[PDB]
Design a protein around this ligand. Structure first.
Ligand SMILES: CC[C@@H](C)C[C@@H](CC)C(C)C
Length: 146
């Protein structure tokens, strides 16, 4: 009853390898490119670009500052995908678990997926994070377009 999945897909005209590796090896540069959305990315454990690294994101939605600590649980170079599992922060006021994945198909299409389990049934499905992820994707595309 508590489980759901949200997905957004959109095209980018910028390079899809550069987009993938932004999130896979350079996530700490994301705040510099989309500062209205994401104000910080600090390495908590491990190393950038390695499975099992843990980062702390400082981000904002509708003018409200929030924090998410995430474990990078998968980086698939072949599929051009990165998966971030939330382990602490604001989102744990609503969810038991929530996982973000970003995939790039370069035959370019960026797909964001949100997999989640709500603490209880009155919790809203986190659709607002799709608007957030589309905004971050559009700022990255604009930055990467020469
Ligand atoms: C939890 C909200 C933001 C900081 C999400 C991040 C995806 C896991 C970010 C890299 C877009």
């Amino acid at each position: 009853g508590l489980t759901g999945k949200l997905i957004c897909q959109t095209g980018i005209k910028s390079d899809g390898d550069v987009f993938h590796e932004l999130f896979g090896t350079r996530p700490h540069h994301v705040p510099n490119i989309t500062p209205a959305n994401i104000q910080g990315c600090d390495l908590h454990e491990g190393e950038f670009g390695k499975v099992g690294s843990v980062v702390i994101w400082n981000y904002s939605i509708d003018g409200n500052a929030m924090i998410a600590k995430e474990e990078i649980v998968a980086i698939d170079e072949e599929d051009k995908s990165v998966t971030f599992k939330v382990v602490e922060g604001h989102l744990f006021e609503e969810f038991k678990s929530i996982v973000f994945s970003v995939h790039v198909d370069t035959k370019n299409l960026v797909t964001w997926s949100i997999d989640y389990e709500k603490l209880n049934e009155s919790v809203k499905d986190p659709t607002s994070y799709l608007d957030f992820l589309l905004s971050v994707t559009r700022d990255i595309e604009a930055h990467h377009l020469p």
